[PDB]
Each structure stands twice: as structure tokens, then as C-alpha cells.
Design a protein around this ligand. Structure first.
Ligand code: GSH
Ligand code: GSH
Ligand code: GSH
Ligand code: GSH
Lengths: 261, 261
């Protein structure tokens, strides 16, 4: 058995692919000058569940006729430490993608947290978020929900199922049970409504689809759809298939990134 | 070693105090009629890090002279299964506290996710959230941040350090490292600014203080301040002491709850 220390020390445990990148301290580790284009929106991201949220919304907005949603899109390679460069830390001191710079105003505005970026864009354009104050509250409920729930899917289930050097029974059981409760929840809501927060497709759908929709379609962690009995959540599956077939979702998944070095 | 199943089954693992309450399915488990008062705001909550966020904001608003922020406050005992009663599930299908009913309008509006409740109240009253659109974005950055980061503190560190039947080396190391990175981040921001998002106390402070401020003050998990070397984050400590001394924070921690049965 393990003797729990009275004060924790970093004794470099092997945490899988992110060992060396994961640290108990925050901050920039090297000077980095990021490229910047001419469009209003400079998006510093990666094709991941969080990153596709934002490229899906931007493509949906473009598709809806909002041509002022044109963006430049740069690859921050988080397996390479790019998120620790000084210019990226200026955009998001948390060193995570996505981070958005909006240089459209008179002052540059940094926007981070994927769910926040969804909100910020939706409010800016008045689209994919209902104007009706009551419908709006219910959309935000699910948006914030996603923000609070995804860590258990990504940081818990994902990490212990896919990344950790050893399969560990008790944490796998704990996060698997939780992810299944989240999938049952979503499935039971989608049994009653065409979209997560009602009758229309919104930023809540985008936020949740990028994680849970891709998960049930078998496009997240290898072997996870089987493991989680994904095809059992048939309301969620059907909603995810519908979304996957939207032309802007396809584009928001296929858009290509500009390198930073 | 453990043989990872190809399809996961619930083989009732002992998860600590929340075994039986934690399930791989969502939904109401019994018919429940919750009490309701006359005030605009009916808050169904518990004195926890999430619950104190909302009672702190309501008390701050009352203290600022907003008397329309009067609320009724009911105890949902999550160690008792209260969060699975049919009326609570109607307020929050995720079966978590806090959940707010605003019955002030012409239509009842359910608001869940603690961070969302903070936003909803702040916007409703125009207080503890800056009006200036640029300052506002930066406040929301930290608000959403808190929403995304707390699961690692609560659902990861908290659970493996405090609740799990056995102390497990690898998950403790993983979530301890993460919680320490979050504390270093906050500490490095508070080195530069009096409050988390700038010069004024906002809902971002409230949201983050209720977790990280109480943690460094030694008011979260027994033995965690020592374990995490809390007194090393002296910017965070000092900010947390300042907040703790606000008269409405005291009230928002001391407010008493009305039972539901
Ligand atoms: N709550 C954040 C989480 C974002 C996040 O986890 N980003 C990952 C990629 S999907 C990342 O940048 N990881 C870098 C690292 O942890 O070093 C959000 O929704 O934006
Ligand atoms: N530092 C992260 C690196 C991996 C990562 O950032 N994962 C993302 C998905 S790409 C995640 O789980 N995000 C959680 C969230 O979105 O809240 C870890 O070790 O878990
Ligand atoms: N992201 C949610 C998390 C809320 C949450 O974790 N609530 C806990 C109490 S602090 C709860 O109700 N737990 C009940 C359970 O898991 O059965 C929020 O911020 O409101
Ligand atoms: N079902 C929860 C019960 C405990 C709980 O709800 N914990 C709260 C704090 S009281 C939490 O960790 N919330 C995470 C968040 O706020 O995002 C678990 O097993 O972790």
C-alpha cells in the first residue's frame, strides 16, 4: 500500500502521453511570437472536442450568411508544448485551447473557455442562441452544464481509459459510471425534444455534440462506444446523426489549420 | 491485474459515502413535493462550495441595497437522495444543487449550474458584473474557467483524497498535480490584480473563492491545505482572507436553510 505523504511532492509519475506537459505550476515556458492574420477573429486551437465546437459555430454562422464571422485559424500543438509559449499564455493564462483573439474593435479582447467562446460569438451575431429571455436561460443551463460535465468525460474517463499507462479498476469504474449517467441524462432529454434545450439547434447542441455526439458515433476514444454501450442511447445517437449531417458541422470538422512555426 | 471488460457493467463498486446515490442512470427515483415560499427566488441548495456561491451573491446584492433579491432557501440533502425527487428533477434534471426557481415573471424559469445562477442574478440586477463590454468578457473568462476547473478539484482531488475507500497513488498524483497547477495559476493572476479579473470584486471572485479560497483557508477537505502546500500561494491566501472578511460573504456562509420534509 501507498503511504499518503503529509505534504505532496512532485515525484515525476508516468501519466501517459502528457507526462512533462502536465505540471503542478502554471505559466509560459518559452518566448513565442504567434502569427496573426487580418480577419476580426484569430482562433488559436486544435482539432479536438473543444476546438471543433468553435470551428462548427463559426462555420454555422458563415453558412447562415454572416460573412463577418470570417476567421484565421492557427494550430497550437498541445502534444508539443505550444500552449506554454509566452504569446499563447497572453491569450489564455490557463494554457488550453481554444483561445480566441477578437481584434475587431478598438481594443483587442481575449476570449477563452470553449463554452464562453460559443456564447461570445452567439451574442455578437444574434444567432444560435434564442432571443426570447426564457428560452435563452434554458439554453445557458445546458451550455454551462456541458462546461461542468465534460471534465469527467475528458479528464476522468478519457484519461483512465485511453491515456493512463495502466488500466485502473476503481477510477475506470467511477468515471465510467459518471459518463453513463451523463449519456442517460442527455438521452432522456432528447427523448422529449428535437434539440437539447428545445425545438431549435443552438450553441448548447454544438457544445454537447462535440463531446457526447462524437462519443456515441465512435469518433472519440478507441473502444469507448463499445465499452459505454453507446448504441443503447438511441435518442442521443439519432440526434447526433442529424447534427453530423448539417453541412456546417462537416465543414467545422474539416477546416484546416495554419501552422505557427 | 484487472481485465478491462469489453462492455462495462455496473458491478456495485464501493465508492465511499456516495455509493447507492451515484448511479449510471439519471432521473427521479420517488415522488417529491417541494415547498415553495412567496419570494421571487426559490433556491434549492445545500451549504457546499457550489451552494455558497449563490447565497454569497444573494447576500451581496441585499447588502448593496437590492431588496428585490430576497429569497427563500431550502435544503436538499444530497447524502439522503433528495436530489432524486420528482420536483427537484423538474428544476434540474441533472440532480445537483444549486437549483434556482425564479417565479417573479409571468412564467416560472428554472436556472441550474452554479456559475450560470451567478450570471443570471448579476445580469438581472446589474451588479457584480461590469457593464463595460471588454471588462465583462474577462470576468466571464474566469467564471467559465471556474466551471471547467472545479470538477478536477471536487470530482478528482476531493473524491480520491477524502472519499474513496482506499488512497490510490496514481489518481491522487494526477488530480493533486492538477489542483496545484490551478492554485499556481490563480496565485500568479492575483499577484498582478486585486481581484481575479481586474480591479473590482465580481461574480468570478465569488465563484472561485467558494472553492479555491475556502481550500487555502483550510475550510474544504480535512488535511488538504497541508497536503497541497496552501500557504505557499500567498497571493491567493491574501485575496481569500480579504473576501472572507466581507460582511455579505459571512452572511452568505451563515444563512440557514428551510427543511423540505
Ligand atoms: N474548460 C476548457 C477545457 C479546454 C481543454 O481541455 N483544452 C485541451 C484540448 S481539448 C488543451 O488545450 N489541453 C492542453 C493541456 O492540458 O496541456 C474549455 O472548455 O475550453
Ligand atoms: N492536461 C490534460 C491533457 C488532455 C486534455 O487536455 N484533454 C481534454 C480533451 S482534448 C479534456 O479532457 N478537456 C476537459 C474539458 O473539456 O473540460 C490531461 O492530462 O487530462
Ligand atoms: N457544475 C455543477 C456541479 C454542482 C454539484 O456538483 N453539486 C453537488 C453538490 S456541491 C451535488 O448536488 N451533488 C449531488 C450528487 O452528485 O448526487 C454546478 O456548478 O452547479
Ligand atoms: N456524485 C458526486 C457527489 C459529490 C459532489 O457532488 N461533489 C461536489 C462538491 S459538493 C463536486 O465535486 N462538484 C464538482 C463541480 O462543482 O464541478 C461525486 O461522487 O463526486
Amino acid at each position: 500500500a501507498y503511504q499518503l505523504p503529509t505534504v505532496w511532492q512532485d515525484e515525476a509519475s508516468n501519466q501517459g502521453a502528457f507526462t512533462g506537459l502536465n505540471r503542478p505550476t502554471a505559466g509560459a515556458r518559452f518566448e513565442q511570437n504567434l502569427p496573426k492574420g487580418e480577419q476580426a477573429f484569430q482562433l488559436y486551437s486544435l482539432r479536438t472536442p473543444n476546438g471543433v465546437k468553435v470551428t462548427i459555430l463559426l462555420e454555422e454562422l458563415l453558412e447562415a450568411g454572416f460573412k463577418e464571422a470570417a476567421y484565421d485559424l492557427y494550430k497550437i500543438a498541445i502534444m508539443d508544448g505550444d500552449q506554454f509559449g509566452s504569446d499563447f499564455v497572453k491569450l489564455n493564462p490557463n494554457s488550453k485551447i481554444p483561445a480566441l483573439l477578437d481584434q475587431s474593435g478598438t481594443e483587442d479582447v481575449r476570449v477563452f473557455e470553449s463554452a464562453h467562446i460559443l456564447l461570445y460569438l452567439a451574442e455578437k451575431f444574434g444567432a444560435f442562441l434564442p432571443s426570447n429571455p426564457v428560452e435563452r436561460v434554458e439554453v445557458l443551463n445546458w451550455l454551462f452544464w456541458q462546461a461542468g460535465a465534460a471534465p469527467f468525460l475528458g479528464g476522468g474517463f478519457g484519461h483512465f481509459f485511453n491515456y493512463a499507462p495502466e488500466k485502473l479498476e476503481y477510477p475506470i469504474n467511477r468515471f465510467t459510471m459518471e459518463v453513463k449517467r451523463q449519456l442517460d441524462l442527455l438521452d432522456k432529454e432528447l427523448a422529449q425534444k428535437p434539440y437539447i434545450a428545445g425545438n431549435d439547434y443552438t450553441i448548447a447542441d454544438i457544445a454537447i455534440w462535440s463531446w457526447y455526439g462524437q462519443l456515441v458515433q465512435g469518433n472519440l476514444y478507441q473502444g469507448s462506444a463499445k465499452f459505454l454501450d453507446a448504441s443503447s442511447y438511441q435518442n442521443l445517437v439519432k440526434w447526433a446523426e442529424k447534427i453530423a449531417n448539417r453541412p456546417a458541422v462537416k465543414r467545422g470538422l474539416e477546416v484546416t489549420y495554419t501552422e505557427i512555426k
